[PDB]
Design a protein around this nucleic acid. Structure first.
Ligand SMILES: [Mg+2]
Lengths: 100, 49, 67, 89
RNA sequence: GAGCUGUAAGUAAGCUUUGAUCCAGAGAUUUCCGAAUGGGGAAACCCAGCAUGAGUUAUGUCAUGUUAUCGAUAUGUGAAUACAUAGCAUAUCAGAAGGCACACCCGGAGAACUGAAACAUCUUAGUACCCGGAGGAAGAGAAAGAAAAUUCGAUUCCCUUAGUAGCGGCGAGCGAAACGGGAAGAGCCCAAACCAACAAGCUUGCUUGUUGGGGUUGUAGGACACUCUACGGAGUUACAAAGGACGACAUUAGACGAAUCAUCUGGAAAGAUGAAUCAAAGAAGGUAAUAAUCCUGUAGUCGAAAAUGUUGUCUCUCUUGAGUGGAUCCUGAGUACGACGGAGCACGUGAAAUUCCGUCGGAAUCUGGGAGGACCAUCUCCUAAGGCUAAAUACUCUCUAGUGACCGAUAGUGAACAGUACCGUGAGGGAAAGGUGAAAAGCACCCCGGAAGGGGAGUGAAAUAGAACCUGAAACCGUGUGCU
RNA sequence: UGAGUAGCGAAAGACGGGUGAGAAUCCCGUCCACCGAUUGACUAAGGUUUCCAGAGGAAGGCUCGUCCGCUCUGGGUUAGUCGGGUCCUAAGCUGAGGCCGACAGGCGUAGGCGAUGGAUAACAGGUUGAUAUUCCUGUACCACCUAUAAUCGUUUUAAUCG
């Protein structure tokens, strides 16, 4: 489960192996947007004259994995209660720095 | 006044009623006397005029 | 705003309702003549009026039980 | 009650040419009579009302993509005043 | 615990880590009609009285309360009529009224087509329809019973007895019960004799009334006579009733939850090939093809501020129980029965006993009364004419969790997008209509054309996937050709 | 398929100019023709936005269409006196108590409701694309309330009201 500012890795699709970072979330369809991944080309009409534009489209969230902060490998995520508050762990190391 | 059958000699059947022998007499009802319908059998039995 | 409202005395609340209703009237007149451009204020003022009425009914209910 | 009797002003070309005289057009709650309208205008705008006329409008049929319905019914009031003027835009 | 302002896409303007949107519990608000109830009325409207209040020089206007009919409970008053009474008036209470899944249950009233190879007794059938009353069940229920052993011991339901015994234009057809095997199991309160009081007549004797106690049955019990005895038991599901405390479970939101990498083909891998790992978890669904190890989950374990529902332990609240005498007193009356006319019992009035309704008659009192299929005698069993009672049983418009050698868009609900288009004055009848793609990346720009349509270019793995969008049969309509 | 077949729903049009991609069919003009106890002008029932302006031409229009009672966007109905209610009653319908009836319910007294009838105060002119006895100007009338007042004189009576 990934937040808005993390640094992830793509594990499925055309762009498998790229890193990028998250910029949008869309939780109702569970599809994130990652920079430089899944780029599309739109035909926009004049609204100024338009033309072909390139932006990123959303990818399904289960095609993305976080990176172990220490060893820098993909990992799943668990939870832990500290100070009576929930944090994220890397299933291969300790705490996971996710402030922004 | 329940219902029943009238029977012929060939035993054909038709619906029919038995009525009660109601009479209009003046009986003592709470306080003032009133004039109501009462059967003759109930009159012979359990009520005073 | 519900915690801020509960500090007001019962006569301040009436004056506040009377002012919010006027403020809302003016916005609806501006919207009709076509010069408002900030349409999000209309819902805000309506919700404040609803909160004021809720807090006013609470006190009147509560005191009658004590009486 | 006064801010609840008057709903909004009507701005059209007939209403504007009426405003060339001293007549102003309003949409009002559909339950009020013209005496309430007269007393509400005087309280809100601080003027002197000479007269007031009213009329009812039926609901109209209308479409939005194979969805047949009706608009709201409405009540319209025209207020002539003796002294003063109402500032609008 | 980071996004959010319905389906619902946009833009605008905004909200949110000082915790929003969202989920559960409890509150507040809740226009008008409708039993509709101030009066009226063509529902969703019109017109009022009374009392407060705002406003106005004052009227007009507005706001808030209250005002149906029957019923109950008080008070006052009182006609033909003297007392009285019928009425009448005032004030408190809020008892009824209407609706439904009204499926199942209990009552009232009750067909015909049909079968009998016609039809009338009979059958369809006490079925359909209509009306009334209710409950989570209802009804029945504690022997005036079943029987014929050496008996049993309230009721209901299941299996058998058995298509037997019986009934029947002895035709068509209708059709039990006891014994035996099981589910469940529970018993009680009155009326009367009598006693103690109180009260009116009365003459203080009696009568009657009111309260309380007592008391409840068959190989007879109880009153009375006498002799032996006391707070432990009992309880809100009948057996009398209220309400407190502290607990324990279960709902109604949730939380944690093991383990995988690489190459090939490809638009994309979960597939193939190779090497690994978890399992109290290899249910299931998603993810760009087919995943135990990617996501949501699963096995397992944890969790409630608040409101409900059960259930314990205290509290609480009630209350003596035996024996002998047995025939001195009490033990359910227009009742039981009978005649006439009917109905229900498997049973068509018959050898009809047994049980109900209408109309007339009309008992007995323990040496009594009833039943054992006309009746009589002897035997055996029981004790009517007052009432209450859980469980085992029936049903599903619903709610929660699941299941299927059930359907897969002419099927399955009439209805996957509707009791809607539409038809009918009305009651009423009643359709047709699912699929772009993995992702809108939904075709910028150029050309012909008024547009609609099209040809290129571009997106895409694919555009003969371009929205009349998966696949795209046949009938049918065309264009070009080899032989004729 | 029948088949480019039957039909295209009573009738008089002609020409010039205009607009348009496109005109027998739309707009303007002249001439001609038809109705005229009516194909003219008012008010009711009934319908329910069909009304007006700007834009449009896929479907509807028995042809065409640049037009439209069709599609899109925005507008339009003003009352003390007009017709109803806050007035009256007819037939009829309901009906407190009441009478009758297996149930359901049927009838009916006082009283209500109910116009198609009785009562009842406004006319002339101006003005819009779309309303007018309603808006504007002029001149009226009818109810009700308060002030300013002669007449008012126990409130029997008297003026008054009843
Ligand atoms: Mg062909």
């Amino acid at each position: 489960h990934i937040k808005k500012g993390d640094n992830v890795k793509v594990i499925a699709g055309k762009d498998k192996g790229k890193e990028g970072k998250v910029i949008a979330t869309l939780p109702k369809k569970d599809r994130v947007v990652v920079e430089g991944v899944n780029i599309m080309k739109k035909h926009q009409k004049p609204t100024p004259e338009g033309g072909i534009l390139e932006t990123e489209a959303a990818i399904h969230v289960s095609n993305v994995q976080l990176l172990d902060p220490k060893t820098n490998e993909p990992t799943r995520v668990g939870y832990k209660f500290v100070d009576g508050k929930k944090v994220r762990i890397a299933k291969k190391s300790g705490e996971e720095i996710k402030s922004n | 006044a329940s219902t029943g059958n009238r029977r012929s000699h060939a035993l054909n059947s038709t619906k029919r009623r038995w009525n009660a022998n109601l009479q209009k007499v003046r009986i003592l009802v709470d306080g003032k006397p009133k004039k109501v319908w009462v059967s003759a059998r109930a009159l012979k039995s359990g009520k005073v005029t | 705003k519900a915690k801020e409202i509960r500090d007001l005395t019962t006569s301040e609340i009436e004056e506040q309702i009377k002012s919010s209703k006027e403020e809302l009237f003016n916005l609806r007149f501006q919207l009709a003549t076509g010069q408002l451009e900030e349409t999000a204020r209309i819902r805000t003022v309506r919700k404040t009026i609803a909160r004021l009425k809720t807090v006013a009914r609470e006190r009147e209910i509560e005191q009658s039980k004590a009486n | 009650e006064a801010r609840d009797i008057l709903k909004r002003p009507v701005i059209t070309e007939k209403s504007s040419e009426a405003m060339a005289e001293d007549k102003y057009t309003f949409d009002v709650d559909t339950r009020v009579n013209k005496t309430q309208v007269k007393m509400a205008v005087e309280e809100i705008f601080n003027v002197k009302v000479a007269s007031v006329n009213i009329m009812n409008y039926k609901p109209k049929k209308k479409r939005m993509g194979r969805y047949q319905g009706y608009t709201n019914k409405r009540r319209k009031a025209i207020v002539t005043l003796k002294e003063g003027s109402i500032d609008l835009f």
